[PDB]
Design a protein around this motif. Structure first.
Motif, PDB file in Angstrom:
ATOM      1  N   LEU A 161      31.371  34.423  39.289  1.00 12.65           N
ATOM      2  CA  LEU A 161      32.680  34.916  38.844  1.00 12.65           C
ATOM      3  C   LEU A 161      33.208  36.050  39.740  1.00 12.65           C
ATOM      4  O   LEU A 161      34.392  36.061  40.121  1.00 12.65           O
ATOM      5  CB  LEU A 161      32.639  35.320  37.357  1.00 12.65           C
ATOM      6  CG  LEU A 161      32.950  34.244  36.288  1.00 12.65           C
ATOM      7  CD1 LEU A 161      32.069  32.986  36.361  1.00 12.65           C
ATOM      8  CD2 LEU A 161      32.883  34.845  34.886  1.00 12.65           C
ATOM      9  N   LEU A 162      32.332  36.983  40.109  1.00 12.98           N
ATOM     10  CA  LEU A 162      32.695  38.052  41.040  1.00 12.98           C
ATOM     11  C   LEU A 162      33.083  37.533  42.435  1.00 12.98           C
ATOM     12  O   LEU A 162      34.031  38.044  43.056  1.00 12.98           O
ATOM     13  CB  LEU A 162      31.568  39.088  41.152  1.00 12.98           C
ATOM     14  CG  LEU A 162      31.330  39.917  39.891  1.00 12.98           C
ATOM     15  CD1 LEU A 162      30.152  40.857  40.100  1.00 12.98           C
ATOM     16  CD2 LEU A 162      32.588  40.681  39.516  1.00 12.98           C
ATOM     17  N   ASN A 163      32.355  36.535  42.930  1.00 12.03           N
ATOM     18  CA  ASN A 163      32.724  35.891  44.198  1.00 12.03           C
ATOM     19  C   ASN A 163      34.077  35.176  44.099  1.00 12.03           C
ATOM     20  O   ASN A 163      34.834  35.128  45.083  1.00 12.03           O
ATOM     21  CB  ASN A 163      31.632  34.921  44.663  1.00 12.03           C
ATOM     22  CG  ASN A 163      30.617  35.584  45.577  1.00 12.03           C
ATOM     23  OD1 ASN A 163      30.912  36.602  46.204  1.00 12.03           O
ATOM     24  ND2 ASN A 163      29.423  34.994  45.678  1.00 12.03           N
ATOM     25  N   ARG A 164      34.361  34.629  42.924  1.00 15.81           N
ATOM     26  CA  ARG A 164      35.651  33.962  42.659  1.00 15.81           C
ATOM     27  C   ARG A 164      36.815  34.947  42.660  1.00 15.81           C
ATOM     28  O   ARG A 164      37.836  34.690  43.301  1.00 15.81           O
ATOM     29  CB  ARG A 164      35.598  33.175  41.337  1.00 15.81           C
ATOM     30  CG  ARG A 164      36.922  32.493  40.954  1.00 15.81           C
ATOM     31  CD  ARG A 164      36.776  31.513  39.780  1.00 15.81           C
ATOM     32  NE  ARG A 164      36.557  32.179  38.495  1.00 15.81           N
ATOM     33  CZ  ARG A 164      36.785  31.622  37.301  1.00 15.81           C
ATOM     34  NH1 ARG A 164      37.274  30.388  37.212  1.00 15.81           N
ATOM     35  NH2 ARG A 164      36.539  32.308  36.188  1.00 15.81           N
ATOM     36  N   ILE A 165      36.667  36.071  41.959  1.00 11.99           N
ATOM     37  CA  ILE A 165      37.716  37.110  41.901  1.00 11.99           C
ATOM     38  C   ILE A 165      38.083  37.599  43.311  1.00 11.99           C
ATOM     39  O   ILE A 165      39.261  37.562  43.723  1.00 11.99           O
ATOM     40  CB  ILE A 165      37.287  38.310  40.985  1.00 11.99           C
ATOM     41  CG1 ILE A 165      37.212  37.893  39.514  1.00 11.99           C
ATOM     42  CG2 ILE A 165      38.192  39.554  41.188  1.00 11.99           C
ATOM     43  CD1 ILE A 165      36.463  38.906  38.638  1.00 11.99           C
ATOM     44  N   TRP A 166      37.076  38.037  44.072  1.00 13.06           N
ATOM     45  CA  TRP A 166      37.352  38.564  45.397  1.00 13.06           C
ATOM     46  C   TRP A 166      37.735  37.481  46.414  1.00 13.06           C
ATOM     47  O   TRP A 166      38.711  37.656  47.152  1.00 13.06           O
ATOM     48  CB  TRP A 166      36.215  39.489  45.893  1.00 13.06           C
ATOM     49  CG  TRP A 166      36.415  40.909  45.447  1.00 13.06           C
ATOM     50  CD1 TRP A 166      37.029  41.907  46.153  1.00 13.06           C
ATOM     51  CD2 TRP A 166      36.020  41.492  44.198  1.00 13.06           C
ATOM     52  NE1 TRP A 166      37.044  43.058  45.425  1.00 13.06           N
ATOM     53  CE2 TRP A 166      36.432  42.841  44.222  1.00 13.06           C
ATOM     54  CE3 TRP A 166      35.362  41.009  43.064  1.00 13.06           C
ATOM     55  CZ2 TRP A 166      36.198  43.723  43.154  1.00 13.06           C
ATOM     56  CZ3 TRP A 166      35.132  41.883  41.997  1.00 13.06           C
ATOM     57  CH2 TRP A 166      35.552  43.226  42.053  1.00 13.06           C
ATOM     58  N   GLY A 167      37.017  36.350  46.417  1.00  9.84           N
ATOM     59  CA  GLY A 167      37.299  35.234  47.336  1.00  9.84           C
ATOM     60  C   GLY A 167      38.708  34.688  47.141  1.00  9.84           C
ATOM     61  O   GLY A 167      39.427  34.446  48.113  1.00  9.84           O
ATOM     62  N   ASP A 168      39.110  34.542  45.884  1.00 10.04           N
ATOM     63  CA  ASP A 168      40.446  34.032  45.568  1.00 10.04           C
ATOM     64  C   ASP A 168      41.563  34.955  46.071  1.00 10.04           C
ATOM     65  O   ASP A 168      42.617  34.454  46.500  1.00 10.04           O
ATOM     66  CB  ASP A 168      40.616  33.792  44.061  1.00 10.04           C
ATOM     67  CG  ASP A 168      39.935  32.508  43.573  1.00 10.04           C
ATOM     68  OD1 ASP A 168      39.206  31.850  44.354  1.00 10.04           O
ATOM     69  OD2 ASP A 168      40.141  32.163  42.388  1.00 10.04           O
ATOM     70  N   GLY A 185      41.756  36.938  35.620  1.00  8.19           N
ATOM     71  CA  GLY A 185      42.430  36.033  36.565  1.00  8.19           C
ATOM     72  C   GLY A 185      43.472  36.729  37.423  1.00  8.19           C
ATOM     73  O   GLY A 185      43.471  37.956  37.552  1.00  8.19           O
ATOM     74  N   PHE A 186      44.358  35.923  38.023  1.00  8.10           N
ATOM     75  CA  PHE A 186      45.416  36.436  38.882  1.00  8.10           C
ATOM     76  C   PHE A 186      46.516  37.154  38.077  1.00  8.10           C
ATOM     77  O   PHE A 186      46.790  36.823  36.907  1.00  8.10           O
ATOM     78  CB  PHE A 186      46.144  35.295  39.587  1.00  8.10           C
ATOM     79  CG  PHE A 186      45.327  34.514  40.571  1.00  8.10           C
ATOM     80  CD1 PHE A 186      44.931  35.074  41.798  1.00  8.10           C
ATOM     81  CD2 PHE A 186      45.032  33.175  40.318  1.00  8.10           C
ATOM     82  CE1 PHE A 186      44.217  34.319  42.730  1.00  8.10           C
ATOM     83  CE2 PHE A 186      44.323  32.405  41.250  1.00  8.10           C
ATOM     84  CZ  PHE A 186      43.911  32.975  42.454  1.00  8.10           C
ATOM     85  N   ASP A 225      50.625  37.457  34.082  1.00 13.58           N
ATOM     86  CA  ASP A 225      49.188  37.125  34.198  1.00 13.58           C
ATOM     87  C   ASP A 225      48.983  35.604  34.144  1.00 13.58           C
ATOM     88  O   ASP A 225      49.680  34.904  33.388  1.00 13.58           O
ATOM     89  CB  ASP A 225      48.379  37.784  33.076  1.00 13.58           C
ATOM     90  CG  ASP A 225      48.365  39.311  33.168  1.00 13.58           C
ATOM     91  OD1 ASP A 225      48.837  39.852  34.186  1.00 13.58           O
ATOM     92  OD2 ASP A 225      47.872  39.957  32.211  1.00 13.58           O
ATOM     93  N   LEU A 226      48.064  35.082  34.952  1.00 14.31           N
ATOM     94  CA  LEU A 226      47.999  33.624  35.181  1.00 14.31           C
ATOM     95  C   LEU A 226      46.640  32.930  35.085  1.00 14.31           C
ATOM     96  O   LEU A 226      46.520  31.765  35.496  1.00 14.31           O
ATOM     97  CB  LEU A 226      48.619  33.272  36.535  1.00 14.31           C
ATOM     98  CG  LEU A 226      50.131  33.495  36.538  1.00 14.31           C
ATOM     99  CD1 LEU A 226      50.644  33.679  37.922  1.00 14.31           C
ATOM    100  CD2 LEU A 226      50.862  32.385  35.797  1.00 14.31           C
ATOM    101  N   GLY A 227      45.622  33.605  34.577  1.00 12.91           N
ATOM    102  CA  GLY A 227      44.262  33.033  34.712  1.00 12.91           C
ATOM    103  C   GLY A 227      43.960  32.676  36.172  1.00 12.91           C
ATOM    104  O   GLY A 227      44.599  33.196  37.087  1.00 12.91           O
ATOM    105  N   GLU A 240      49.757  28.014  39.961  1.00 12.99           N
ATOM    106  CA  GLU A 240      50.655  28.810  39.128  1.00 12.99           C
ATOM    107  C   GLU A 240      50.977  30.153  39.746  1.00 12.99           C
ATOM    108  O   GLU A 240      52.094  30.630  39.629  1.00 12.99           O
ATOM    109  CB  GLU A 240      50.117  28.961  37.690  1.00 12.99           C
ATOM    110  CG  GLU A 240      50.488  27.759  36.812  1.00 12.99           C
ATOM    111  CD  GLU A 240      49.883  27.811  35.422  1.00 12.99           C
ATOM    112  OE1 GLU A 240      49.387  28.895  35.021  1.00 12.99           O
ATOM    113  OE2 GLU A 240      49.903  26.769  34.725  1.00 12.99           O
ATOM    114  N   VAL A 241      50.019  30.796  40.417  1.00 17.00           N
ATOM    115  CA  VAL A 241      50.416  32.066  41.047  1.00 17.00           C
ATOM    116  C   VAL A 241      51.519  31.871  42.076  1.00 17.00           C
ATOM    117  O   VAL A 241      52.512  32.619  42.087  1.00 17.00           O
ATOM    118  CB  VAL A 241      49.229  32.871  41.609  1.00 17.00           C
ATOM    119  CG1 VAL A 241      49.681  34.314  41.959  1.00 17.00           C
ATOM    120  CG2 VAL A 241      48.197  32.947  40.592  1.00 17.00           C
TER     121      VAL A 241
END
Length: 166
Positions: free
Chosen positions: A8-15, A73-74, A141-143, A148-149
């Motif tokens: 999840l942390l890799n997803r937040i920063w990677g995204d 999310g975003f 806010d967009l998950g 969608e972002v």
């Protein structure tokens, strides 16, 4: 837990690193800055504003914009001077976006509109007019929905253009 939390942390920063490069390319005419770390920001979890003492990633989009991600999310947010706004813009933005917040300098303190307990656009405008806040922020806010972002930033910019805001 650990394997899932690491992912999840890799997803937040990677995204956000990914989205920054994408919007840099796509939002031509807007100055898109580098990703930085934001500490001590609040987020609305389970009906309450809670402080994140940990950093989360965000990047500026001038003028007055930020795009970022938290464990929710975003999100993106644009700030506009109160004197540039109008009741009609407020009404339109409320109808245009789902997970919308409108707030002054501090999200946890100066909330004009919270989509989880929505009020009318007229009441939102009255609260703004009667406030001590010069800059008004509109956050969507967009998950973790990349499509969608991109689409919602586009819709926001197009709405803002109609009011000579962007």
């Amino acid at each position: 837990m650990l394997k899932e939390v690491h992912e999840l942390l890799n997803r937040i920063w990677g995204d956000i690193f990914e989205l920054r490069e994408e919007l840099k390319e796509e939002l031509k005419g807007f100055t898109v800055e580098e990703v930085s770390e934001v500490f001590n920001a609040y987020l609305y979890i389970d009906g309450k504003w809670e402080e994140m003492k940990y950093p989360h990633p965000a990047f500026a989009v001038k003028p007055g914009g930020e795009v970022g991600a938290t464990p929710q999310g975003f999100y993106f947010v644009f700030a506009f001077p109160k004197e540039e706004l109008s009741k009609e813009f407020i009404e339109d933005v409320i109808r245009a976006f789902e997970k919308l917040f409108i707030y002054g300098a501090e999200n946890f303190l100066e909330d004009f509109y919270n989509f989880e307990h929505p009020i009318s656009g007229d009441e939102v405008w009255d609260r703004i007019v009667n406030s001590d806040e010069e800059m008004i922020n509109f956050e969507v806010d967009l998950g973790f929905d990349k499509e969608e972002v991109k689409r919602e930033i586009k819709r926001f910019i197009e709405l803002a253009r109609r009011y000579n805001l962007l």
